[PDB]
Every structure is written in structure tokens, then in C-alpha cells.
PDB file of C-alpha atoms and ligand atoms in Angstrom:
ATOM      1  CA  UNK Y   1      63.800 176.791   4.185  1.00 26.14           C
ATOM      2  CA  UNK Y   2      62.595 176.057   7.822  1.00 28.07           C
ATOM      3  CA  UNK Y   3      59.669 178.010   9.145  1.00 30.34           C
ATOM      4  CA  UNK Y   4      59.359 178.462  13.023  1.00 30.99           C
ATOM      5  CA  UNK Y   5      56.246 177.043  14.088  1.00 30.60           C
ATOM      6  CA  UNK Y   6      53.715 179.780  15.138  1.00 30.71           C
ATOM      7  CA  UNK Y   7      52.279 180.144  19.207  1.00 31.55           C
ATOM      8  CA  UNK Y   8      50.005 177.063  19.407  1.00 30.48           C
ATOM      9  CA  UNK Y   9      51.369 174.845  16.880  1.00 25.87           C
ATOM     10  CA  UNK Y  10      53.848 172.504  18.678  1.00 26.01           C
ATOM     11  CA  UNK Y  11      51.071 171.889  21.461  1.00 26.94           C
ATOM     12  CA  UNK Y  12      48.712 170.403  18.943  1.00 32.67           C
ATOM     13  CA  UNK Y  13      47.690 166.805  19.131  1.00 32.36           C
ATOM     14  CA  UNK Y  14      48.513 165.149  15.934  1.00 33.11           C
ATOM     15  CA  UNK Y  15      47.998 161.944  14.162  1.00 34.60           C
ATOM     16  CA  UNK Y  16      50.595 159.298  13.583  1.00 34.85           C
ATOM     17  CA  UNK Y  17      50.642 156.559  11.142  1.00 33.70           C
ATOM     18  CA  UNK Y  18      52.432 153.340  12.547  1.00 32.93           C
ATOM     19  CA  UNK Y  19      52.967 149.834  11.301  1.00 30.47           C
ATOM     20  CA  UNK Y  20      53.251 148.358  14.856  1.00 31.92           C
ATOM     21  CA  UNK Y  21      50.125 146.796  16.210  1.00 27.65           C
ATOM     22  CA  UNK Y  22      48.149 148.391  18.657  1.00 27.39           C
ATOM     23  CA  UNK Y  23      48.671 146.468  22.245  1.00 27.47           C
ATOM     24  CA  UNK Y  24      45.455 144.448  23.171  1.00 28.16           C
ATOM     25  CA  UNK Y  25      46.342 144.248  26.535  1.00 29.57           C
ATOM     26  CA  UNK Y  26      49.132 146.638  27.840  1.00 30.12           C
ATOM     27  CA  UNK Y  27      48.336 146.610  31.374  1.00 30.73           C
ATOM     28  CA  UNK Y  28      49.052 142.718  31.176  1.00 32.56           C
ATOM     29  CA  UNK Y  29      45.858 142.293  33.138  1.00 35.31           C
ATOM     30  CA  UNK Y  30      44.443 138.709  33.549  1.00 37.32           C
ATOM     31  CA  UNK Y  31      40.957 137.806  33.440  1.00 40.33           C
ATOM     32  CA  UNK Y  32      38.386 139.684  35.231  1.00 38.92           C
ATOM     33  CA  UNK Y  33      36.232 137.871  37.622  1.00 39.98           C
ATOM     34  CA  UNK Y  34      32.694 137.016  36.666  1.00 37.97           C
ATOM     35  CA  UNK Y  35      30.008 138.895  37.704  1.00 36.87           C
ATOM     36  CA  UNK Y  36      27.312 137.953  40.363  1.00 35.99           C
ATOM     37  CA  UNK Y  37      24.004 137.163  38.339  1.00 35.45           C
ATOM     38  CA  UNK Y  38      21.555 140.129  38.170  1.00 34.49           C
ATOM     39  CA  UNK Y  39      17.671 139.955  39.191  1.00 34.41           C
ATOM     40  CA  UNK Y  40      15.506 139.045  36.520  1.00 30.37           C
ATOM     41  CA  UNK Y  41      11.756 137.715  36.784  1.00 26.62           C
ATOM     42  CA  UNK Y  42       8.554 139.108  37.903  1.00 24.88           C
ATOM     43  CA  UNK Y  43       8.240 140.021  41.382  1.00 26.47           C
ATOM     44  CA  UNK Y  44       5.462 137.688  43.370  1.00 28.64           C
ATOM     45  CA  UNK Y  45       4.235 138.454  46.888  1.00 26.90           C
ATOM     46  CA  UNK Y  46       5.764 136.711  49.713  1.00 24.43           C
ATOM     47  CA  UNK Y  47       4.495 133.285  50.351  1.00 25.82           C
ATOM     48  CA  UNK Y  48       2.282 133.247  53.189  1.00 25.29           C
ATOM     49  CA  UNK Y  49       3.634 136.844  54.265  1.00 27.83           C
ATOM     50  CA  UNK Y  50       6.477 137.608  56.431  1.00 23.74           C
ATOM     51  CA  UNK Y  51       6.661 134.164  58.179  1.00 20.34           C
ATOM     52  CA  UNK Y  52       7.827 136.319  61.310  1.00 19.23           C
ATOM     53  CA  UNK Y  53       6.937 133.740  64.152  1.00 20.03           C
ATOM     54  CA  UNK Y  54       2.990 133.931  64.246  1.00 21.26           C
ATOM     55  CA  UNK Y  55       2.224 136.934  61.962  1.00 25.72           C
ATOM     56  CA  UNK Y  56       0.160 135.745  59.026  1.00 28.26           C
ATOM     57  CA  UNK Y  57       0.764 138.817  56.799  1.00 26.18           C
TER      58      UNK Y  57
ATOM     59  CA  UNK Z   1     -18.710 123.050  63.848  1.00 27.24           C
ATOM     60  CA  UNK Z   2     -19.161 119.927  61.780  1.00 28.20           C
ATOM     61  CA  UNK Z   3     -16.192 117.361  62.206  1.00 29.71           C
ATOM     62  CA  UNK Z   4     -15.661 117.533  58.373  1.00 29.50           C
ATOM     63  CA  UNK Z   5     -15.136 121.315  58.687  1.00 29.26           C
ATOM     64  CA  UNK Z   6     -12.750 121.143  61.821  1.00 28.56           C
ATOM     65  CA  UNK Z   7     -11.053 118.216  60.055  1.00 27.94           C
ATOM     66  CA  UNK Z   8     -10.311 120.114  56.757  1.00 26.66           C
ATOM     67  CA  UNK Z   9      -9.487 123.442  58.281  1.00 27.16           C
ATOM     68  CA  UNK Z  10      -7.221 121.606  60.171  1.00 29.88           C
ATOM     69  CA  UNK Z  11      -5.467 120.238  57.227  1.00 27.15           C
ATOM     70  CA  UNK Z  12      -5.458 123.619  55.632  1.00 28.68           C
ATOM     71  CA  UNK Z  13      -3.709 125.333  58.540  1.00 26.66           C
ATOM     72  CA  UNK Z  14      -1.226 122.293  58.654  1.00 26.05           C
ATOM     73  CA  UNK Z  15      -0.296 122.801  55.063  1.00 22.22           C
ATOM     74  CA  UNK Z  16       0.435 126.456  55.529  1.00 22.55           C
ATOM     75  CA  UNK Z  17       2.236 126.089  58.682  1.00 24.04           C
ATOM     76  CA  UNK Z  18       4.046 123.272  57.286  1.00 23.07           C
ATOM     77  CA  UNK Z  19       4.972 125.414  54.216  1.00 24.86           C
ATOM     78  CA  UNK Z  20       6.210 128.313  56.197  1.00 20.81           C
ATOM     79  CA  UNK Z  21       8.386 125.939  58.565  1.00 23.42           C
ATOM     80  CA  UNK Z  22      10.127 124.655  55.318  1.00 23.97           C
ATOM     81  CA  UNK Z  23      10.593 128.239  53.787  1.00 22.12           C
ATOM     82  CA  UNK Z  24      12.129 129.409  57.182  1.00 23.39           C
ATOM     83  CA  UNK Z  25      14.516 126.512  57.004  1.00 26.25           C
ATOM     84  CA  UNK Z  26      15.577 127.363  53.548  1.00 33.03           C
ATOM     85  CA  UNK Z  27      15.608 130.939  54.193  1.00 35.88           C
ATOM     86  CA  UNK Z  28      18.494 129.908  57.031  1.00 36.89           C
ATOM     87  CA  UNK Z  29      20.472 127.766  54.588  1.00 38.10           C
ATOM     88  CA  UNK Z  30      20.279 130.604  51.908  1.00 39.15           C
ATOM     89  CA  UNK Z  31      21.462 132.975  54.397  1.00 34.55           C
ATOM     90  CA  UNK Z  32      24.097 130.799  55.463  1.00 36.59           C
ATOM     91  CA  UNK Z  33      25.364 130.129  51.811  1.00 35.21           C
ATOM     92  CA  UNK Z  34      25.129 133.823  50.581  1.00 35.31           C
ATOM     93  CA  UNK Z  35      27.343 135.026  53.436  1.00 33.41           C
ATOM     94  CA  UNK Z  36      29.838 131.924  53.096  1.00 32.22           C
ATOM     95  CA  UNK Z  37      30.188 132.342  49.291  1.00 30.82           C
ATOM     96  CA  UNK Z  38      29.123 135.995  48.448  1.00 30.95           C
ATOM     97  CA  UNK Z  39      27.646 135.187  45.043  1.00 25.82           C
ATOM     98  CA  UNK Z  40      24.331 135.828  45.710  1.00 22.68           C
ATOM     99  CA  UNK Z  41      22.177 139.376  45.948  1.00 22.75           C
ATOM    100  CA  UNK Z  42      22.617 139.219  49.880  1.00 23.29           C
ATOM    101  CA  UNK Z  43      25.730 140.502  52.038  1.00 17.39           C
ATOM    102  CA  UNK Z  44      26.835 142.301  48.937  1.00 17.95           C
ATOM    103  CA  UNK Z  45      29.030 144.443  50.623  1.00 18.01           C
ATOM    104  CA  UNK Z  46      30.391 147.774  48.517  1.00 18.32           C
ATOM    105  CA  UNK Z  47      33.989 148.007  46.533  1.00 15.76           C
ATOM    106  CA  UNK Z  48      35.070 151.131  44.409  1.00 13.84           C
ATOM    107  CA  UNK Z  49      33.041 152.118  41.515  1.00 16.18           C
ATOM    108  CA  UNK Z  50      35.353 151.562  38.061  1.00 16.47           C
ATOM    109  CA  UNK Z  51      33.552 154.352  36.684  1.00 15.80           C
ATOM    110  CA  UNK Z  52      35.217 156.904  38.797  1.00 18.25           C
ATOM    111  CA  UNK Z  53      38.873 155.731  36.986  1.00 16.69           C
ATOM    112  CA  UNK Z  54      40.169 158.289  34.836  1.00 14.84           C
ATOM    113  CA  UNK Z  55      41.283 156.577  31.537  1.00 18.73           C
ATOM    114  CA  UNK Z  56      42.726 159.691  29.761  1.00 19.69           C
ATOM    115  CA  UNK Z  57      46.644 159.986  28.782  1.00 20.31           C
ATOM    116  CA  UNK Z  58      48.471 161.178  31.764  1.00 16.97           C
ATOM    117  CA  UNK Z  59      51.271 163.709  31.926  1.00 18.30           C
ATOM    118  CA  UNK Z  60      53.720 160.544  31.991  1.00 17.49           C
ATOM    119  CA  UNK Z  61      53.207 157.416  29.814  1.00 15.81           C
ATOM    120  CA  UNK Z  62      53.929 154.702  32.317  1.00 15.31           C
ATOM    121  CA  UNK Z  63      50.769 154.089  33.776  1.00 14.38           C
TER     122      UNK Z  63
HETATM  123  C1  CDL G   1     -14.791 144.405  49.921  1.00 12.29           C
HETATM  124  C2  CDL G   1     -13.715 145.679  50.327  1.00 12.29           C
HETATM  125  C3  CDL G   1     -14.472 145.792  52.014  1.00 12.29           C
HETATM  126  C4  CDL G   1     -14.235 144.215  52.761  1.00 12.29           C
HETATM  127  C5  CDL G   1     -14.194 144.665  54.493  1.00 12.29           C
HETATM  128  C6  CDL G   1     -13.784 143.725  55.209  1.00 12.29           C
HETATM  129  C7  CDL G   1     -13.574 143.804  56.838  1.00 12.29           C
HETATM  130  C8  CDL G   1     -15.370 144.330  57.104  1.00 12.29           C
HETATM  131  C9  CDL G   1     -15.385 144.292  58.559  1.00 12.29           C
HETATM  132  C10 CDL G   1     -14.421 145.789  59.263  1.00 12.29           C
HETATM  133  C11 CDL G   1     -13.228 145.618  60.336  1.00 12.29           C
HETATM  134  C12 CDL G   1     -12.310 144.431  60.128  1.00 12.29           C
HETATM  135  C13 CDL G   1     -11.250 144.388  60.789  1.00 12.29           C
HETATM  136  C14 CDL G   1      -9.964 143.869  60.627  1.00 12.29           C
HETATM  137  C15 CDL G   1     -10.138 142.147  60.479  1.00 12.29           C
HETATM  138  C16 CDL G   1      -9.982 141.310  61.827  1.00 12.29           C
HETATM  139  C17 CDL G   1      -8.449 141.503  62.197  1.00 12.29           C
HETATM  140  C18 CDL G   1      -8.437 140.363  63.321  1.00 12.29           C
HETATM  141  O1  CDL G   1      -8.932 140.486  64.602  1.00 12.29           O
HETATM  142  O2  CDL G   1      -7.476 139.731  63.263  1.00 12.29           O
HETATM  143  C19 CDL G   1      -7.279 138.628  64.336  1.00 12.29           C
HETATM  144  C20 CDL G   1      -6.206 138.211  64.801  1.00 12.29           C
HETATM  145  C21 CDL G   1      -5.516 136.818  64.254  1.00 12.29           C
HETATM  146  O3  CDL G   1      -6.483 135.815  64.288  1.00 12.29           O
HETATM  147  P1  CDL G   1      -6.678 135.173  63.418  1.00 12.29           P
HETATM  148  O4  CDL G   1      -7.816 134.055  63.863  1.00 12.29           O
HETATM  149  O5  CDL G   1      -5.672 134.109  62.887  1.00 12.29           O
HETATM  150  O6  CDL G   1      -7.063 135.748  61.892  1.00 12.29           O
HETATM  151  C22 CDL G   1      -8.403 136.099  61.930  1.00 12.29           C
HETATM  152  C23 CDL G   1      -8.849 137.155  60.617  1.00 12.29           C
HETATM  153  O7  CDL G   1      -8.458 136.211  59.283  1.00 12.29           O
HETATM  154  C24 CDL G   1      -7.865 138.267  60.668  1.00 12.29           C
HETATM  155  O8  CDL G   1      -7.362 138.488  58.989  1.00 12.29           O
HETATM  156  P2  CDL G   1      -5.828 138.204  58.899  1.00 12.29           P
HETATM  157  O9  CDL G   1      -5.407 137.086  58.950  1.00 12.29           O
HETATM  158  O10 CDL G   1      -5.503 138.955  57.425  1.00 12.29           O
HETATM  159  O11 CDL G   1      -4.830 139.134  60.077  1.00 12.29           O
HETATM  160  C25 CDL G   1      -3.692 139.664  59.783  1.00 12.29           C
HETATM  161  C26 CDL G   1      -2.925 139.566  60.745  1.00 12.29           C
HETATM  162  C27 CDL G   1      -3.434 138.345  61.476  1.00 12.29           C
HETATM  163  O12 CDL G   1      -2.462 138.451  62.863  1.00 12.29           O
HETATM  164  C28 CDL G   1      -1.643 137.908  63.051  1.00 12.29           C
HETATM  165  O13 CDL G   1      -1.077 137.472  62.015  1.00 12.29           O
HETATM  166  C29 CDL G   1      -0.895 137.554  64.473  1.00 12.29           C
HETATM  167  C30 CDL G   1      -0.511 138.749  65.003  1.00 12.29           C
HETATM  168  C31 CDL G   1      -1.335 139.805  65.560  1.00 12.29           C
HETATM  169  C32 CDL G   1      -0.894 140.766  66.809  1.00 12.29           C
HETATM  170  C33 CDL G   1      -0.456 140.064  67.925  1.00 12.29           C
HETATM  171  C34 CDL G   1       0.353 141.035  69.052  1.00 12.29           C
HETATM  172  C35 CDL G   1       0.704 140.737  70.263  1.00 12.29           C
HETATM  173  C36 CDL G   1       1.365 141.502  71.061  1.00 12.29           C
HETATM  174  C37 CDL G   1       0.157 142.871  71.239  1.00 12.29           C
HETATM  175  C38 CDL G   1      -0.975 142.313  72.017  1.00 12.29           C
HETATM  176  C39 CDL G   1      -2.042 143.485  72.089  1.00 12.29           C
HETATM  177  C40 CDL G   1      -2.684 143.864  73.289  1.00 12.29           C
HETATM  178  C41 CDL G   1      -4.388 143.391  73.377  1.00 12.29           C
HETATM  179  C42 CDL G   1      -5.121 144.680  73.278  1.00 12.29           C
HETATM  180  C43 CDL G   1      -5.082 145.473  74.553  1.00 12.29           C
HETATM  181  C44 CDL G   1      -6.373 146.491  74.365  1.00 12.29           C
HETATM  182  C45 CDL G   1      -6.324 147.459  73.294  1.00 12.29           C
HETATM  183  O14 CDL G   1      -3.441 141.083  61.466  1.00 12.29           O
HETATM  184  C46 CDL G   1      -2.471 141.864  61.606  1.00 12.29           C
HETATM  185  O15 CDL G   1      -1.056 141.352  61.548  1.00 12.29           O
HETATM  186  C47 CDL G   1      -2.718 143.282  62.612  1.00 12.29           C
HETATM  187  C48 CDL G   1      -2.179 143.147  63.761  1.00 12.29           C
HETATM  188  C49 CDL G   1      -3.526 142.818  64.833  1.00 12.29           C
HETATM  189  C50 CDL G   1      -4.241 144.103  64.791  1.00 12.29           C
HETATM  190  C51 CDL G   1      -5.679 143.533  64.332  1.00 12.29           C
HETATM  191  C52 CDL G   1      -6.827 144.649  63.891  1.00 12.29           C
HETATM  192  C53 CDL G   1      -7.189 145.443  64.446  1.00 12.29           C
HETATM  193  C54 CDL G   1      -8.113 146.372  64.096  1.00 12.29           C
HETATM  194  C55 CDL G   1      -8.859 147.320  65.468  1.00 12.29           C
HETATM  195  C56 CDL G   1      -7.904 148.077  66.316  1.00 12.29           C
HETATM  196  C57 CDL G   1      -8.791 148.296  67.761  1.00 12.29           C
HETATM  197  C58 CDL G   1      -8.020 147.756  68.788  1.00 12.29           C
HETATM  198  C59 CDL G   1      -7.438 146.344  68.764  1.00 12.29           C
HETATM  199  C60 CDL G   1      -6.803 145.729  70.200  1.00 12.29           C
HETATM  200  C61 CDL G   1      -5.541 146.355  69.734  1.00 12.29           C
HETATM  201  C62 CDL G   1      -4.314 145.054  69.589  1.00 12.29           C
HETATM  202  C63 CDL G   1      -4.216 144.574  68.565  1.00 12.29           C
HETATM  203  O16 CDL G   1      -6.251 138.129  66.077  1.00 12.29           O
HETATM  204  C64 CDL G   1      -5.502 138.290  67.212  1.00 12.29           C
HETATM  205  O17 CDL G   1      -4.070 138.296  66.997  1.00 12.29           O
HETATM  206  C65 CDL G   1      -5.894 138.538  68.401  1.00 12.29           C
HETATM  207  C66 CDL G   1      -6.687 140.045  69.056  1.00 12.29           C
HETATM  208  C67 CDL G   1      -7.607 140.476  68.384  1.00 12.29           C
HETATM  209  C68 CDL G   1      -7.236 141.138  66.933  1.00 12.29           C
HETATM  210  C69 CDL G   1      -8.128 143.049  67.408  1.00 12.29           C
HETATM  211  C70 CDL G   1      -9.654 142.552  67.014  1.00 12.29           C
HETATM  212  C71 CDL G   1     -10.126 143.367  65.503  1.00 12.29           C
HETATM  213  C72 CDL G   1     -11.253 143.967  66.173  1.00 12.29           C
HETATM  214  C73 CDL G   1     -11.790 144.837  67.573  1.00 12.29           C
HETATM  215  C74 CDL G   1     -12.838 145.738  67.481  1.00 12.29           C
HETATM  216  C75 CDL G   1     -13.084 145.866  68.944  1.00 12.29           C
HETATM  217  C76 CDL G   1     -12.166 147.190  69.552  1.00 12.29           C
HETATM  218  C77 CDL G   1     -12.454 147.476  70.949  1.00 12.29           C
HETATM  219  C78 CDL G   1     -12.074 149.055  71.481  1.00 12.29           C
HETATM  220  C79 CDL G   1     -10.576 148.947  71.357  1.00 12.29           C
HETATM  221  C80 CDL G   1      -9.746 147.953  72.340  1.00 12.29           C
HETATM  222  C81 CDL G   1      -9.924 148.493  73.534  1.00 12.29           C
END
């Protein structure tokens, strides 16, 4: 009583019901480094300008 | 000019230039620390963008 599969059927992506748990860390990765702090706050003008040796702006 | 005017104008000049000098010294120390530690917004040299990684199931499982 076995029916041979049609062209296209064995290449389908199927769904599988398993009782084993999903691997939470399959790459066995350690903790990622903490990122650098982002920029935040309002952008105020430079205090007394460029401060390049004698320029006042 | 009155001596009062030149005196207090000198005080305004001295305050501005002392504040600029303190900011230059702080700028040198900030640049030194950020180049040494790499934890600031400056001296951030590029690494590879992780958004380029394909996370799809590959042809072989062990990857
Ligand atoms: C309500 C809305 C309307 C409001 C309107 C208000 C205005 C009404 C009047 C309109 C006109 C305003 C003009 C601008 C304001 C005055 C700027 C000024 O004098 O700054 C003083 C500036 C600093 O003095 P200060 O006492 O501390 O500040 C006074 C103000 O608070 C200065 O203010 P500050 O603190 O904000 O200044 C900022 C900063 C102040 O400066 C600094 O922070 C210090 C660094 C300055 C630069 C130093 C460079 C050193 C190496 C190069 C040397 C050059 C060679 C000399 C010139 C060779 C001959 C051409 O300036 C700069 O960074 C700009 C660089 C210098 C250019 C100055 C403006 C020139 C405009 C006209 C150009 C014509 C040719 C001029 C000669 C070319 C060389 C400049 O003086 C100098 O550095 C000495 C040089 C003098 C500058 C030029 C004078 C401008 C007028 C010239 C007219 C005659 C031209 C003759 C024919 C052409 C030449 C053959």
C-alpha cells in the first residue's frame, strides 16, 4: 500500500514534533562584551570656540 | 579707559583664558584615556559588522 512520492514532495521542508528541548546555546558561546556607551544629550556649542592657540571662535 | 574698566575687562580675559587652558588640559587627558582604553567615542577603529553573517541552515549541520 505504499505510494511513491511525486516530483517535489521529498524536497519539502516539513515540521517535526520533538520532545527534546531546544538548545539554548548550541554554539557554546560565552558572554558577549558590553558595548560602548552611546551618544545622548543635546549638542551645545563648543566652550569658547575651537580653543586652538589664539582663535576665539 | 577708566582703571575700573581695564581691571574688570582683564578679569573677564583671565577667566576666559583660564577656562580654555583647563579645557585643553582635560582634552589631552581625555585623548590619552580613550586611546589607552578604547571605551570612548574616539579611537573607535572598525571591526566587522555582524549583520553580514548568514544565520540560515547551511548544507551541512555542524556550523
Ligand atoms: C545685527 C546684525 C548685523 C551686525 C553687524 C556687526 C558688524 C558691523 C561692522 C561690519 C564689519 C565687521 C568686521 C568683522 C568684525 C571684526 C573682526 C576683527 O577685526 O577681528 C579682530 C581680530 C582679533 O582681535 P580682538 O581684539 O581679539 O577681537 C575684536 C572683535 O571682538 C572681533 O570679533 P571676534 O572675537 O568674533 O573675532 C573672531 C576671530 C578673532 O580672531 C581671533 O580669534 C584671532 C586669530 C585671527 C587671525 C590671525 C591670523 C594670523 C596669521 C595671518 C596674518 C594675516 C596677514 C595680515 C593682513 C595682510 C594684509 C591683507 O576672527 C577670526 O577668526 C577671523 C580671522 C581674521 C579675520 C578678521 C575679519 C576680517 C574681515 C575683513 C577682511 C579684510 C582684510 C583683512 C586682512 C587680512 C587678514 C585677516 O584681530 C586680529 O586678529 C588682527 C587683524 C585684524 C583683522 C582684520 C580687521 C577687519 C576689518 C578690516 C577693514 C579694512 C580692510 C583694508 C583693506 C584690505 C586689507 C589690505
